[PDB]
Amino acid sequence: AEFLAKISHEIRTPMNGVLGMTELLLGTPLSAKQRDYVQTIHSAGNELLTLINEILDISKLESGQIELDEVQFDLNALIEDCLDIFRVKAEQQRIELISFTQPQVPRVIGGDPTRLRQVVLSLLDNAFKQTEEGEILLVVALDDQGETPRLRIAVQDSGHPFDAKEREALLTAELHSGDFLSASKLGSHLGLIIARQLVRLMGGEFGIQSSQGTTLSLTLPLDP
Amino acid sequence: EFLAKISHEIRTPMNGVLGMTELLLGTPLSAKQRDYVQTIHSAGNELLTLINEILDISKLESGQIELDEVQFDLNALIEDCLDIFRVKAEQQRIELISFTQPQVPRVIGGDPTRLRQVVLSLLDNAFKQTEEGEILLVVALDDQGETPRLRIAVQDSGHPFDAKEREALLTAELHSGDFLSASKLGSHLGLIIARQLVRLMGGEFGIQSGGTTLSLTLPLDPQ
Ligand SMILES: [Co+2]
Ligand SMILES: [Co+2]
Ligand SMILES: [Co+2]
Ligand SMILES: [Co+2]
Ligand SMILES: [Co+2]
Numbered sequence: 329a330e331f332l333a334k335i336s337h338e339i340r341t342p343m344n345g346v347l348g349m350t351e352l353l354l355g356t357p358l359s360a361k362q363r364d365y366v367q368t369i370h371s372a373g374n375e376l377l378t379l380i381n382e383i384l385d386i387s388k389l390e391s392g393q394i395e396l397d398e399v400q401f402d403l404n405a406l407i408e409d410c411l412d413i414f415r416v417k418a419e420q421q422r423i424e425l426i427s428f429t430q431p432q433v434p435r436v437i438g439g440d441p442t443r444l445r446q447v448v449l450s451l452l453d454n455a456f457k458q459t460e461e462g463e464i465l466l467v468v469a470l471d472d473q474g475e476t477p478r479l480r481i482a483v484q485d486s487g488h489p490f491d492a493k494e495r496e497a498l499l500t501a502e503l504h505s506g507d508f509l510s511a512s513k514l515g516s517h518l519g520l521i522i523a524r525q526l527v528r529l530m531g532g533e534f535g536i537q538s539s540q541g542t543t544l545s546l547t548l549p550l551d552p
Numbered sequence: 553e554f555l556a557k558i559s560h561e562i563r564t565p566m567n568g569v570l571g572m573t574e575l576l577l578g579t580p581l582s583a584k585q586r587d588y589v590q591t592i593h594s595a596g597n598e599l600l601t602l603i604n605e606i607l608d609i610s611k612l613e614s615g616q617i618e619l620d621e622v623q624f625d626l627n628a629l630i631e632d633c634l635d636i637f638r639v640k641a642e643q644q645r646i647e648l649i650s651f652t653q654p655q656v657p658r659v660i661g662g663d664p665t666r667l668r669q670v671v672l673s674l675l676d677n678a679f680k681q682t683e684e685g686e687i688l689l690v691v692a693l694d695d696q697g698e699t700p701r702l703r704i705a706v707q708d709s710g711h712p713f714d715a716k717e718r719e720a721l722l723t724a725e726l727h728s729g730d731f732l733s734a735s736k737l738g739s740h741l742g743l744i745i746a747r748q749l750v751r752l753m754g755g756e757f758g759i760q761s762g763g764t765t766l767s768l769t770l771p772l773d774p775q
Pocket of ligand 4: 517
């Protein structure tokens with residue numbers, strides 16, 4: 329569980345060198361063609377760096393090395409910010425972005441806002457790629473089927489459903505170390521798996537129900 | 553080269569970055585900019601090689617890698633591994649030479665892609681360790697033990713492995729307490745792969761330092 333965190337410098341350093349030279353190159357005289365290429369390094373490198381930081385983060389959380397945060401944060405404000413991120417692409421016609429919050433769910437809860445926002449942003453990001461046309465729905469409800477009101481966040485899309493094999497793969501997913509860097513053509517990309525493993529470390533339960541769309545949902549514990 | 557495939561999520565952005573570096577090198581650049589681009593090119597590849605090695609060791613220790621059983625021209629295989637390093641031996645002024653005992657068969661059984669990975673690993677380690685000496689590749693039969701076995705060794709005149717470095721190579725395993733020092737891994741993760749492969753081939757991996765001589769001994773089908 330601790331191997332990737334221990335070599336965190338050996339992984340992050342070349343990635344840091346790539347982007348440091350990039351921001352250095354943007355400072356120098358560049359032709360428009362030159363700038364197109366250097367800008368692409370910037371965009372692609374940062375994409376990869378963000379992936380590497382999320383792999384190290386989940387690696388340290390799965391081992392005992394670091395702990396989730398516990399602060400009182402504005403739950404509605406978090407959900408609102410996530411929606412804002414995607415509203416520019418929802419501006420494009422194909423997609424309607426609709427969010428419904430039950431009136432009883434609290435305005436402020438306790439937990440890890442930065443990591444919960446990662447989870448929600450991942451579910452939204454998958455919903456967008458799955459839909460070519462239609463509506464994307466984000467519902468924040470309370471869940472009473474337990475012995476105490478849990479919190480429920482669900483994202484629903486209109487794209488090509490999950491089959492039983494993909495669904496079972498993501499539900500039981502718990503990658504160890506090398507697994508994160510490994511290729512598996514089946515099913516889900518890293519963001520979804522990491523987000524799903526975060527909800528398990530949050531004490532929550534993860535749900536995938538699919539007829540012509542999929543509903544991905546997390547259900548978290550709430551302090552009464 | 554490598555046993556395992558990296559996620560396309562890692563691979564695709566990196567391919568893009570590396571793609572832009574090659575395009576920019578085709579462009580007029582100040583000596584400062586060429587250095588920035590060459591550094592990006594160096595870093596991207598080193599990260600990719602690191603990730604691939606970590607993945608290969610995970611697969612090997614997990615028993616997730618299956619070796620092939622085909623017949624292959626051992627001489628061919630040997631002479632293309634050396635072929636790969638000749639352009640580098642010219643630049644580093646190195647003299648790379650080899651010797652094959654005539655009693656060695658031309659054709660043997662096994663996994664030529666993997667045996668190739670092992671041999672490329674030893675040569676790559678020898679060019680690292682040697683600023684300048686001779687790098688020798690021996691293919692020979694070994695007549696100790698019950699049956700004849702195939703022996704491949706690479707000898708260099710570089711800075712040798714100390715006693716703790718050598719014990720690490722022979723004994724380090726990923727799910728031992730502290731598998732390896734974060735300094736040596738980038739340096740010599742590849743040799744641990746080679747060791748894992750030779751043992752998966754049913755052979756023995758050996759190192760003797762004084763220069764260094766890395767050797768493997770592999771089984772042979774009699775006759
Ligand atoms: Co360190
Ligand atoms: Co920037
Ligand atoms: Co399908
Ligand atoms: Co993809
Ligand atoms: Co290149």
